[PDB]
Amino acid sequence: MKELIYIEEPSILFAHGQKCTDPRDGLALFGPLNQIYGIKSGVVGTQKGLQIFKSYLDKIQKPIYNHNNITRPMFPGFEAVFGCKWESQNIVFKEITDEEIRRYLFNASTHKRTYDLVTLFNDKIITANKNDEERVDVWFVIVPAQFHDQLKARLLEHTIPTQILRESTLAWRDFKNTFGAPIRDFSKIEGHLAWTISTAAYYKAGGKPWKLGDIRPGVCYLGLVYKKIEKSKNPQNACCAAQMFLDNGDGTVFKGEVGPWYNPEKGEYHLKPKEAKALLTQALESYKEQNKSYPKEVFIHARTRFNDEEWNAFNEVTPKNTNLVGVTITKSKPLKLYKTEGAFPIMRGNAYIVDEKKAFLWTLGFVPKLQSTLSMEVPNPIFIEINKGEAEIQQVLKDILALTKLNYNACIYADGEPVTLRFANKIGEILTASTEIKTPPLAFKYYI
Amino acid sequence: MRNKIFISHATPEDDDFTRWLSLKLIGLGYEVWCDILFLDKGVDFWSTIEKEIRENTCKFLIVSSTAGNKREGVLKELAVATKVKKHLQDDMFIIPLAIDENLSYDDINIEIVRLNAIDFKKSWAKGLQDLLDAFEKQNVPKKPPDHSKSNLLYQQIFLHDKQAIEKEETYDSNWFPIISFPNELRFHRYDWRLPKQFDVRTLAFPAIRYKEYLCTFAWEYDFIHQLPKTETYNGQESIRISTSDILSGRYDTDFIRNYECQRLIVQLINKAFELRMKDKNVREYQMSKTFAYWIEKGKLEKDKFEKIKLVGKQKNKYWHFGISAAGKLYPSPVLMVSSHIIFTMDGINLIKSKSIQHSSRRKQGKNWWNDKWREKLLAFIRFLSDDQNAIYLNVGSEEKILISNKPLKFFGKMSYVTPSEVTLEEESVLADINNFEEDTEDLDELEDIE
DNA sequence: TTAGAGCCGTCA
RNA sequence: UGACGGCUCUAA
Ligand SMILES: [Mg+2]
């Protein structure tokens, strides 16, 4: 008997002052914001992966089709969408000298193997970026317990972007299973697979494809979400990571003070008030540094509810003009709103509000510009609530819908949850891999 | 007024670069005409030949990729283009925008290799500016560059094709409202009427034990069977709380606030579900953190209930619809169920390994969508219902909760495009004896293939 | 109440 | 060990 609400899809901004909702469609027509003419993206990997990479590069120039080419549009070619040259010759294409195949003796330690392989790639990148003079922008790694986080963790301290690919994804067509089937069948998503790789590798090569262009000045969509470390000796010890996000998407990241913020009995996550003031002030001072004016609002996002004493650790470091509200974001709570008739679920952008604080938002569904739903079955929404502070629920709903579209690791139409959450999720795990380094750098390239 | 560029391509066939090339061409400044770029009355007709190929064209572009030598559309316009070039007595009019690399040198249209061909097979980076430089050296007219029109015209092509439409319609929720509740809640405790060693989860009626404060919903004389010395007491000394006010939050005392009571009702409203699953004749599954309940094999009319196939066979395995319940009462006192699909080889014994259960679960729900899922959820609720209007969940000897079967209705504003038949795929109906008759052959063969 | 992990189809 | 979604099991 009640009534729903819909939010118009925020329009991102591309080069030449042109705004198109679809990141893939607008990019092809117009091009990225910053035209990095020199894309000298280096490659570091084994020879088989290198020629797999080399074969893939010329494939990037050629158009790559999706057998269903309305939901996952064309990928005409890197020089067409971006207007920046990229080939298999300008690369430095240094080779990982891993052809040694010999075993004097093994050991019953997978972590030692995991540490060995991760270490064997870090030094090779290090020995290259210092010796050379030409501007290598990426160091794609080829791979024939966890590897990616620590490989990025050690590389984090050296301030040099890196991407890891090609377990089976780059050459899936030939890299079939053991029974004559594609172990990762990309025949349906061949055109889309090259889309994300081209967009992501461009961004971490000094790029910045698109940024939002319908914002009100003076805002700051900081993202603060707790993480967990399973290797900490203290049972309650877990990492907290902040995340600065402006309209452009090129914010700053500060490692929060790790400490025992886990409560086994209460099942909640909160920090001491003293360091809460520093984390907000450090982030607040950084935004003032990059904008010269203090923000009129701080929509700090979170995924866990917070107490009041922590809130009182924010109301005093915030100037009188500034206002700050901490919105919690959850998705475990389900509300599947099946359509009355037809097999097509509700489009993304619809939202359910229950009060001035709690609300449901559907960021998934059949897109009215895609004729397809980004979810396998009927998609559940995200439960977002204004935990503390007073704000407008419609504004945060519209902004959180906008912030979901600004994802650069992937060129999908719109992420299900804000990048302030997912990007924080991976960087926290990277931090837990190597907590030694105090790494404050503005760039997200050494992270994503 | 001769400041236009003509594009010829196989509109229905696999020629889709004409869209992006035209947008860039109009983006760069050239006034480009294509089949798709003019979509308001048909697609292609004699009107293209009538005016623009004669009086309003400067270049003619052919997408000779796969069937340029064969398709009538490319050939019939090329015949017009060839003779209209002779009328102008020009030199460079038609351009062979070869696309497909597989088009061999010995397999090419005779009527196109008359003029030199720009190359697009290996990469566009050679071909994109090749049109540009050729236009400049041939003094092709150029409006000043502007990408505003490219964005504007891009929207118009795919505006009526697809966008959000403000037409009101309703949605069927996953939430089942509760409208009838017992008028009072009673807590029984003497610290000696029951011990703190026996299990309360196995009690005949919904009740659990806390460290110091006991909870239940029945009288003091309904728990003799589990352990004696309970019926002798009177109900006047029990702790009675009005249920109508225990949820609104108006009640609040020293022992528990209103919020502790909300968590207690949730525990009672959920633990009581398992007893109703011994009344409707369904099997129980030891699901993680919850319990999934599904109907047995062929219990209803040939594995289906109310013309809904709640039970079916996936090739070798048997799949059955099932749900797990959860009671939340924050926005309103409602019941929530999580849809589930449970597999069994035959029904006598379920599959021991959970990994195969989930992997098989993933494939089965892959070809499922909104209505195919919604109608199969409401079906498992109506059958579970003890009455047409609502279900009867027993919590007390003389008082039982009443949960409606029809979920709450939400109505929106934006649904989908005005024209119907969004996806015209697999709509015909043929005389078949079994569901997925020809479909299983397609699915099984593809698994063998890949 | 919340995380971490883990298989797996690619969106009628 | 491209990306998203989906549930599914794991404790605390
Ligand atoms: Mg990435």
mmCIF file with all atom_site columns, C-alpha atoms (C1' of nucleotides) and ligand atoms in Angstrom, chain A residues 148 163 200 204 409-410 426 447-448, chain D residues 1-3, ligand 1:
data_model
loop_
_atom_site.group_PDB
_atom_site.id
_atom_site.type_symbol
_atom_site.label_atom_id
_atom_site.label_alt_id
_atom_site.label_comp_id
_atom_site.label_asym_id
_atom_site.label_entity_id
_atom_site.label_seq_id
_atom_site.pdbx_PDB_ins_code
_atom_site.Cartn_x
_atom_site.Cartn_y
_atom_site.Cartn_z
_atom_site.occupancy
_atom_site.B_iso_or_equiv
_atom_site.pdbx_formal_charge
_atom_site.auth_seq_id
_atom_site.auth_comp_id
_atom_site.auth_asym_id
_atom_site.auth_atom_id
_atom_site.pdbx_PDB_model_num
ATOM   1  C  CA    . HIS A 1 148 ? 47.842 -9.851  -4.729  1.00 0.00 ? 148 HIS A CA    1
ATOM   2  C  CA    . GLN A 1 163 ? 48.667 -4.357  -12.012 1.00 0.00 ? 163 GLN A CA    1
ATOM   3  C  CA    . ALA A 1 200 ? 41.601 0.500   -15.709 1.00 0.00 ? 200 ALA A CA    1
ATOM   4  C  CA    . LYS A 1 204 ? 46.644 3.680   -13.363 1.00 0.00 ? 204 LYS A CA    1
ATOM   5  C  CA    . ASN A 1 409 ? 39.001 -0.358  -11.569 1.00 0.00 ? 409 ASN A CA    1
ATOM   6  C  CA    . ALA A 1 410 ? 36.060 -1.444  -13.741 1.00 0.00 ? 410 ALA A CA    1
ATOM   7  C  CA    . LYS A 1 426 ? 40.784 -3.965  -0.929  1.00 0.00 ? 426 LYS A CA    1
ATOM   8  C  CA    . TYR A 1 447 ? 46.084 0.564   -4.678  1.00 0.00 ? 447 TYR A CA    1
ATOM   9  C  CA    . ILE A 1 448 ? 43.121 -0.303  -6.889  1.00 0.00 ? 448 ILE A CA    1
ATOM   10 C  "C1'" . U   D 2 1   ? 46.030 -14.561 -9.123  1.00 0.00 ? 1   U   D "C1'" 1
ATOM   11 C  "C1'" . G   D 2 2   ? 40.693 -8.899  -15.334 1.00 0.00 ? 2   G   D "C1'" 1
ATOM   12 C  "C1'" . A   D 2 3   ? 35.800 -7.304  -13.251 1.00 0.00 ? 3   A   D "C1'" 1
HETATM 13 MG MG    . MG  E 3 .   ? 41.872 -3.661  -10.203 1.00 0.00 ? 1   MG  E MG    1
#
